[PDB]
């Protein structure tokens, strides 16, 4: 719905150069931590990480121009396809970003009966991730156990 004038948003593109600092067109935890270190001196290592997770609304793990506008405009997320798995997902997601990072299972698996070690948390998702992108999406989640 609607559109955005790329010509007018060109002023915001300056954040993909000056804000970026390195000039690669992608805001990552490194450059962000650099800017926040000189013009901030408050956000910790874990802070800038969570902060970036507060920007990435698509879950691609990379700050892109399209989501830049979304972050600075409408912070709302829908949900209505994961019904049953949602009951499980809300507990499996923990942080609330859809994809499984690692820390989430470190809670549900440790509360599963045994204790989940951080060394096995990588091996487990590497078995879970059928695509091999490094993340656990709802797609592969249902297309693994429920889908025979």
């Amino acid at each position: 719905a609607d559109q955005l004038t790329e010509e007018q948003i060109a002023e915001f593109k300056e954040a993909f150069s000056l804000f970026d600092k390195d000039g690669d067109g992608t805001i990552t935890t490194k450059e962000l931590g650099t800017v926040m270190r000189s013009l901030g001196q408050n956000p910790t290592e874990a802070e800038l990480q969570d902060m970036i997770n507060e920007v990435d609304a698509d879950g691609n793990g990379t700050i892109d121009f399209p989501e830049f506008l979304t972050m600075m405009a409408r912070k709302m997320k829908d949900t209505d396809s994961e019904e049953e798995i949602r009951e499980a997902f809300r507990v499996f997601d923990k942080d609330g970003n859809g994809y499984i990072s690692a820390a989430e299972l470190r809670h549900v698996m440790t509360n599963l009966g045994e204790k989940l070690t951080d060394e096995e948390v990588d091996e487990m998702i590497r078995e879970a991730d059928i695509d091999g992108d490094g993340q656990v999406n709802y797609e592969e989640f249902v297309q693994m156990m429920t889908a025979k």
């Binding site: 299972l105 989940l116 091996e123 487990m124 879970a128 429920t146």
Partner: peptide
Amino acid sequence: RAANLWPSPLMIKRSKKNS
């Protein structure tokens, strides 16, 4: 491998939701 643990919570959820 905790992989088998992946289906456990999900299976338990399915069972609980089916119950």
